[PDB]
């Protein structure tokens, strides 16, 4: 009836609550206190955060709700344009790029990307094989080396060579700093003052860097004529069956920037959290390592063998359950409608799906919801509708889901085949928030099982 709402700060409404280093975790705590739905107001805007499967299953009804761009996504659109993740469903370029790119992201496409994924995965294993006795691994940093290199190579046949360096690539410097400006711009009480003029000049400089670098990648490929098995070739050559049109070079650039963001720390976060949960749950690690040793019987894994890593796949889903690295998505009501028989919404009203809190709904998962139990995922039919949404919803779901899960299953399987792991610091989980999530400072030691490649 009277929708719950967290504490307000006069004319700033709830905005100061997101002036925090960990806003998603702060919102999760508000959900703990207020329940399945709460209103969140800022100057000139309002949304409603949903946390229960009961309400989110209705929000996922595409006849009633469509994808909205959150304030964060609207700011990211300043450098991802009408790429797939920041276009509205009704923009011509969304359905056009969706139709063109779907065959590039299917399981059949993964068979083609597999060899390049193995290339990078072997580089990761060789790095760890070559560490000296007393040394340790910085898990998120090395996982980000893996995922960035993989999307660079599979995306446009470019070698970031992240395992050869510590200084970030110039593109990544600007990309990370652009995303940082989005974070700072959100939790600005007075974001219009001229005190942020430098931040805005730097922001425009970083957009130009990303545009210039990707634009020349596209120009270089058209000039060379090479037809590699990557996303850029498919975008240069594909035609939308509906309109009959190809993507233009500007939109191709937006897609590439989008893929680079998604394949960076959003994807590496899944691997980082998965390894964290494995080392914190030794019986689960042992079961996953037993599968890896049984299935990965060749020096280089095949595509088919990765598909046979069923338990590793469940490990990844359970890591996505507890700490999904794209932690929210936004919706708007297409028409007047009533949520859950109790909350009337008007056309245009916005919703936020708080994914980590949805995934803690005890009415779905039981009381042991904080425990890491991959066996929860043995049967998708036993999971209620819309209870598990780490890849979003409907036609606006993650197009990269098969790509992320294939590269994650491949390298996690290889990690489990080749090394025993030690939580040598008894690492205390500390989740750093950018626009994604990562276990900050997570370190392990890896002792080789001395299995050759």
Ligand X SMILES: O=C(CCCCCn1ccnc1)N[C@@H](Cc1ccccc1)C(=O)O
Q: How far is the CB of 392 from ligand HEM (least distance, A)?
A: 3
Is position 357 an interface residue for ligand HEM (rule: CB under 6 A)? no
Is position 374 an interface residue for ligand HEM (rule: CB under 6 A)? no
Is position 439 an interface residue for ligand HEM (rule: CB under 6 A)? no
How many residues in the chain?
A: 453
Residue 327 contact among ligand HEM, ligand X, none, beta carbon within 5 to 8 Å by kind: ligand X
Q: How far is the CB of 266 from ligand X (least distance, A)?
A: 4
Burial of 111 (0-12, 13-18, 19+ CB in 10 A): middle
Which listed range, 211-219, 234-242, 270-278, 328-336, lies at the site for ligand X (CB under 6 A)? 328-336
Q: Under a CB-based contact definition with an 8 Å cutoff, are residues 72 and 42 in contact?
A: no
113 is in an annotated binding site: no
Rounded CA-CA distance 122/260 in Å is 21
Q: How far is the CB of 206 from ligand X (least distance, A)?
A: 15
SS3 state at 187: coil
Is position 330 an interface residue for ligand X (rule: CB under 6 A)? yes
**Of residues 85, 175, 292, 358, which one binds ligand X by CB under 6 A?**
85
Nearest to 53 by CA among 300, 310, 359: 359
Q: How far is the CB of 404 from ligand HEM (least distance, A)?
A: 4
* Complex with ligand HEM: residue 13 or 389, whichever CB lies closer: 389
Radius of gyration of the chain (CA): 22
158 is in an annotated binding site: no
Binding mask 123-162 for ligand HEM (x = CB under 6 A): ----------------------------x-----------
Residues of span 61-80 touching ligand X by CB under 6 A: 70, 72-73, 76
The torsion angles phi and psi of 195, rounded to 5 degrees, stand at -70, -20
Q: Under a CB-based contact definition with an 8 Å cutoff, are residues 34 and 4 in contact?
A: yes
Is position 396 an interface residue for ligand HEM (rule: CB under 6 A)? yes
**Of residues 261, 285, 345, 351, which one binds ligand X by CB under 6 A?**
261
Is position 238 an interface residue for ligand HEM (rule: CB under 6 A)? no
**Of residues 262, 271, 289, 315, which one binds ligand X by CB under 6 A?**
262
* Complex with ligand HEM: residue 86 or 337, whichever CB lies closer: 86
Distance, C-alpha 115 to centroid of its chain: 23
Is position 326 an interface residue for ligand HEM (rule: CB under 6 A)? yes
The torsion angles phi and psi of 369, rounded to 5 degrees, stand at -65, -25
* E-assigned strand segments in 73-212: 137-138
Strand 45-50 with 350-354, pairing: parallel
Q: How far is the CB of 402 from ligand X (least distance, A)?
A: 13
Q: How far is the CB of 16 from ligand HEM (least distance, A)?
A: 25
Burial of 418 (0-12, 13-18, 19+ CB in 10 A): buried
Rounded CA-CA distance 218/235 in Å is 10
* Complex with ligand X: residue 55 or 351, whichever CB lies closer: 351
* Complex with ligand X: residue 260 or 296, whichever CB lies closer: 260
Is position 256 an interface residue for ligand X (rule: CB under 6 A)? no
Rounded CA-CA distance 150/113 in Å is 9
Residue 261 contact among ligand X, ligand HEM, none, beta carbon within 5 to 8 Å by kind: ligand X
Is position 101 an interface residue for ligand X (rule: CB under 6 A)? no
DSSP 216-257: HHHHHHHHH----SSHHHHHHH---TTT-PPPPHHHHHHHHH
Q: How far is the CB of 448 from ligand X (least distance, A)?
A: 33
Q: Which residues contact 396 (CB under 8 A, 6 or more apart)?
A: 66, 67, 89, 329
Is position 436 an interface residue for ligand X (rule: CB under 6 A)? yes
Is position 42 an interface residue for ligand HEM (rule: CB under 6 A)? no
Is position 270 an interface residue for ligand HEM (rule: CB under 6 A)? yes
Rounded CA-CA distance 269/274 in Å is 8
* Complex with ligand X: residue 27 or 153, whichever CB lies closer: 27
Would you tell me the crossing angle of helices 267-280 and 139-156 to the nearest 10 degrees? 140
Query: How many Cβ atoms from other residues are within 10 Å of residue 362's Cβ?
Result: 10
Query: How many Cβ atoms from other residues are within 10 Å of residue 195's Cβ?
Result: 10
**Of residues 324, 374, 413, 439, which one binds ligand HEM by CB under 6 A?**
324
Angle (CA) 196-199-201 rounded to 5° is 110
E strand or H helix at 271, and its extent?
helix 267-280
**Residue numbers at the binding site for ligand X (CB under 6 A):** 70, 72-73, 76, 85, 261-262, 266, 326-330, 398, 435-436
Q: Mark the binding-site residues for (9Z)-hexadecenoate, compressed into ranges.
A: 49
Annotated binding site: 49, 398
Q: Which residues are annotated as a binding site for heme?
A: 398
């Amino acid at each position: 009836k009277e929708m719950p709402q967290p504490k307000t700060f006069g004319e700033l409404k709830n905005l100061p609550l997101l002036n925090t280093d960990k806003p998603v975790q702060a919102l999760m705590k508000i959900a703990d206190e207020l329940g399945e739905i709460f209103k969140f107001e800022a100057p000139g805007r309002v949304t409603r955060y949903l946390s229960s499967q009961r309400l989110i299953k209705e929000a996922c009804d595409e006849s009633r709700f469509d994808k909205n761009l959150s304030q964060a996504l609207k700011f990211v659109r300043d450098f991802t344009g009408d790429g797939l993740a920041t276009s509205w469903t009704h923009e011509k370029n969304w359905k056009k790029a969706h139709n063109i790119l779907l065959p590039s992201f299917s399981q059949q496409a993964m068979k083609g990307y597999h060899a390049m994924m193995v290339d990078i995965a072997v580089q990761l294993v060789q790095k760890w094989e070559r560490l000296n006795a007393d040394e340790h691994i910085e898990v998120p940093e090395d996982m980000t080396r893996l995922t960035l290199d993989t999307i660079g190579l599979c995306g446009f046949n470019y070698r970031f060579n992240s395992f050869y360096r510590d200084q970030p690539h110039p593109f990544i410097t600007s990309m990370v700093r652009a995303l940082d400006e989005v974070m700072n711009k959100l939790q600005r009480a007075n974001p219009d003052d001229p005190a942020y003029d430098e931040n805005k000049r730097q922001f425009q400089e970083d957009i130009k860097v990303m545009n210039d670098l990707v634009d020349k990648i596209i120009a270089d490929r058209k000039a060379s004529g090479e037809q590699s098995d990557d996303l850029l070739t498919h975008m240069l050559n594909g035609k939308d069956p509906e309109t009959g049109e190809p993507l233009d070079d500007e939109n191709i650039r937006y897609q590439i920037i989008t893929f680079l963001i998604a394949g960076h720390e959003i994807t590496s976060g899944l691997l980082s959290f998965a390894l964290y949960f494995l080392v914190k749950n030794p019986h689960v690690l042992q079961k996953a390592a037993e599968e890896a040793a049984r299935v990965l019987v060749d020096p280089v894994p095949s595509y088919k063998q990765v598909k046979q890593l069923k338990y590793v796949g469940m490990v990844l889903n359970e890591a996505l359950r507890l700490w999904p690295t794209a932690p929210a998505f936004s919706l708007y009501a297409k028409e007047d409608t009533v949520l859950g028989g109790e909350y009337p919404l008007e056309k245009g009203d916005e919703l936020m799906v708080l994914i980590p809190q949805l995934h803690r709904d005890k009415t779905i998962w039981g009381d042991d919801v904080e425990e890491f139990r991959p066996e929860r995922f043995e049967n998708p039919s036993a999971i209620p509708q819309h209870a598990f949404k780490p890849f979003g919803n409907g036609q606006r779901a993650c197009i990269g889901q098969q790509f992320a899960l294939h590269e994650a299953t491949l390298v996690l399987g290889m990690m489990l085949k080749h090394f025993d792991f030690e939580d040598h610091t008894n690492y205390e989980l500390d989740i750093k928030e950018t626009l994604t999530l990562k276990p900050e400072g997570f370190v392990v030691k890896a002792k080789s099982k001395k299995i050759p490649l």
